């Protein structure tokens, strides 16, 4: 404020006005009319959650039971439909390995490593993402070779082709780091969603759609990909067996 780096934040006619916990009373759940009911400022209040299949119902259920603490929340009157912006302070439960959930790891065609667990899914990268640096490196290697073949010779073949060899060499380090970060994100999901068992499909088939497209990351052994998820697996603890 004093240095003048930021102006005075003002308010508008549509700012959600705040309110604390003392305003809300009787924070319980109602099943007969299907609405978590309460009483704000001498006025009873029932929520029209609509077709809410998201985590809002679960969050409300923990909130009324006292499992989740509530902070100073806000009320908005956006477009007639009254809305409640509730801020919840939730204790971070200690996530530990629970070997009873199955994690489904698959290779794909434009959506590299695909991981499915329960109602959750995550993709590790994307096809053009993995191919951008590869295409750049290959094209640059082509033009470097063309320039070197047309450059001044007689100063040594090593001085002529060290960059030519290094440009092909760095592709290997690129793909190695790529497999590294991919397995890192796979293990990150495995730890994050408390998954205990992870299994990687062969998912190879024959003819059909496959046998014409070569699969991003190819088979489950490209650049020791399998190994780089095995050695990493028990590095974190999750159980990656076989599929």
């Amino acid at each position: 404020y004093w240095k003048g780096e930021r102006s005075l934040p003002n308010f508008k006619k549509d700012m959600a006005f705040p309110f604390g916990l003392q305003g809300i009373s009787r924070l319980v759940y109602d099943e007969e009319k299907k609405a978590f009911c309460f009483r704000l400022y001498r006025v009873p209040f029932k929520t029209y959650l609509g077709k809410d299949f998201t985590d809002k119902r679960m969050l409300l259920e923990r909130l009324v039971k006292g499992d989740v603490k509530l902070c100073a929340s806000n009320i908005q009157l956006n477009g007639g439909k009254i809305f409640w912006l509730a801020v919840f302070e939730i204790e971070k439960e200690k996530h530990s390995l629970k070997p009873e959930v199955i994690a489904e790891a698959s290779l794909s065609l434009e959506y590299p490593i695909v991981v499915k667990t329960g109602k959750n899914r995550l993709t590790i990268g994307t096809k053009e993402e993995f191919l951008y640096r590869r295409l750049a490196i290959q094209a640059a290697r082509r033009r470097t070779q063309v320039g070197a073949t047309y450059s001044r010779s007689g100063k040594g073949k090593k001085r002529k082709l060290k960059a030519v060899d290094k440009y092909h060499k760095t592709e290997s380090n690129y793909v190695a780091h790529r497999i590294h970060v991919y397995s890192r994100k796979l293990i990150d999901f495995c730890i994050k969603h408390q998954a205990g068992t992870l299994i990687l499909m062969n998912q190879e088939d024959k003819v059909g759609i496959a046998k014409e497209e070569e699969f991003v990351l190819r088979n489950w052994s490209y650049y020791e990909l399998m190994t780089k998820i095995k050695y990493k697996a028990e590095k974190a603890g999750i159980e990656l067996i076989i599929g």
Partner: protein, 87 residues
């Protein structure tokens, strides 16, 4: 029965003079319609690279195997429902 339900063109005298005829205007119109369809498809192909990469590959696969939601879903990772929704 089918072969006995078929007459002979010789039963009509000088049938080669006034029957079995065609108009080249129809052929030219058919080829023009084909060219119009080809131009529309070329327009669509030119629009394709402007789309997101996943949705472009979905269409490209759907144009070389053909609205095979099942085999595409196993190929992709998304389910039948998700893959159909993305298509």
């Amino acid at each position: 029965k089918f072969h006995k339900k078929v007459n002979s063109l010789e039963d009509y005298d000088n049938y080669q003079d006034y029957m079995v005829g065609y108009d080249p205007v129809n052929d030219s119109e058919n080829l023009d319609e084909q060219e119009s369809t080809q131009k529309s498809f070329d327009h669509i192909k030119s629009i394709l690279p402007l789309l997101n990469a996943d949705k472009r590959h979905l269409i490209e696969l759907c144009l070389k195997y053909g609205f095979q939601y099942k085999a595409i879903s196993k190929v992709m990772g998304k389910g039948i429902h998700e893959t159909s929704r993305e298509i």
